[PDB]
Design a protein around this ligand. Structure first.
Ligand SMILES: NC1=N[C@@]2(CO1)c1cc(-c3cncc(Cl)c3)ccc1O[C@H]1COCC[C@@H]12
Ligand code: NI
Length: 400
């Protein structure tokens, strides 16, 4: 292999509203646009009319649909989705030339799940069974794909971030390569960090720098209470203490400009006149990730072109306006699109590792580029992993 032409450019989306892939469900195939989400583990599709859906999965139209006679209820921070579990035939038209029988959660009711204008009608959870709902016995899509076909246990993502239009958000594109690595999608070295545990795609950050300046924190703070690689999150999200330190450093480096507090909170845009954005006043951010070798790390470095998100405003379309896309977390580090848009990211499930290489499509300028660099060696490395306190709820679970 080394080339997967038919799968290149199979992702679409609107800036800040997630990347989706075309999928078909049922016999005959019903086409739906599905959010590619490495931060969840259910395949769930709209299956009833909704204000924001132009279309939905029609179970009755599918000769191959089977009801599992079990419901599912998924609450979260922003809202909830719920529905009926079943199985049906699933394919990815611009993916591998295979059809599989997968679990599908047919979403019958939801609150603040679907997004007006996003153009997606469902979610493809690509993480592991451990975080599937209602429980880990509901096989995720990718597990079924690998078990039922000869597709190698690996996928890779090239998310290409963003203007033509003032009335709508900017269109984005990218590639999901299932079963391999496409060498046309990256340049330079591909560096791997271990998947610490197979639930989320959990990784370990050992060091953080802002414009070459070490944040000098106990490295467990970087992974408190976890660090994950998540295509279903827009922002780089950082643990409270890390967020505060990072913002302070970025503020100081960019101090020639005085932005409102709303900007640093991601609640307000800042603008410059077309093409005059002073990129050079904003620092690079480096995350050092644990290497496959003990005592080694490598760094991924992103630019303000990644963490400042373009939003073309109607009232001031002569200007280039940006949202600050680094935000606070209380559930650990989330390396979302802000990180992933810099890189070609290889989810090597077979070898329990995640690969990063400089993306052939990343946004940069003539002075700086997103980078992937290593090795960095450290004498006698402290364990940077955090151990989440075990609740009685969690401890009570039997795993046969
Ligand atoms: N990983 C991740 N997936 C989550 C939350 O975190 C998600 C994301 C979006 C979503 C909305 N707008 C833009 C993007 Cl990139 C994603 C919309 C719904 C949505 O549902 C959440 C359901 O619970 C699992 C995690 C899901
Ligand atoms: Ni038991």
């Amino acid at each position: 292999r080394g080339s997967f032409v038919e799968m290149v450019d199979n992702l679409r989306g609107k800036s800040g509203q997630g990347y989706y892939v075309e999928m078909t469900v049922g016999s005959p195939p019903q086409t739906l646009n599905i959010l590619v989400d490495t931060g969840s583990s259910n395949f769930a599709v709209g299956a009833a009319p909704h204000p924001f859906l132009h279309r939905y999965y029609q179970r009755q139209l599918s000769s191959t649909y089977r009801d599992l006679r079990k419901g599912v209820y998924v609450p979260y921070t922003q809202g909830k989705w719920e529905g009926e579990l079943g199985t049906d035939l699933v394919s990815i038209p611009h993916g591998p030339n295979v059809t599989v029988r997968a679990n599908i959660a047919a979403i019958t009711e939801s609150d603040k799940f679907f997004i007006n204008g996003s153009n997606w009608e469902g979610i493809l959870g690509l993480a592991y069974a451990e975080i599937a709902r209602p429980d880990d016995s509901l096989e995720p899509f990718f597990d079924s794909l690998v078990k039922q076909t000869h597709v190698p246990n690996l996928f890779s993502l090239q998310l290409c971030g963003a203007l033509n239009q003032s009335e709508v958000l900017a269109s984005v594109g990218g590639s999901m390569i299932i079963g391999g690595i496409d060498h046309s999608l990256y340049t330079g070295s591909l560096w791997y960090t271990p998947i610490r545990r197979e639930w989320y795609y959990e990784v370990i950050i050992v060091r953080v720098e802002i414009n070459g300046q070490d944040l000098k924190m106990d490295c467990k703070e970087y992974n408190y209470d976890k660090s994950i690689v998540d295509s279903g999150t827009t922002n780089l999200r950082l643990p409270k203490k890390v967020f505060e330190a990072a913002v302070k450093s970025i503020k100081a480096a960019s101090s020639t400009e005085k932005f409102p507090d709303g900007f640093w909170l991601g609640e307000q845009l800042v603008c410059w006149q077309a093409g005059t954005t002073p990129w050079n006043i904003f620092p690079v951010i480096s995350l050092y990730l644990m290497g496959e070798v003990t005592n080694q790390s490598f760094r991924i470095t992103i630019l303000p072109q990644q963490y400042l998100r373009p939003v073309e405003d109607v009232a001031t379309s002569q200007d280039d306006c940006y949202k600050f896309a680094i935000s606070q977390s209380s559930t650990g580090t989330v390396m979302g699109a802000v990180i992933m848009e810099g890189f070609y990211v290889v989810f090597d499930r077979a070898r329990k590792r995640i690969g990063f290489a400089v993306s052939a499509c990343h946004v940069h300028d003539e002075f700086r580029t997103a980078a992937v660099e290593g090795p960095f060696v450290t004498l006698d490395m402290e364990d940077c992993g955090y151990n989440i306190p075990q609740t009685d709820e969690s401890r009570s679970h039997h795993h046969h």
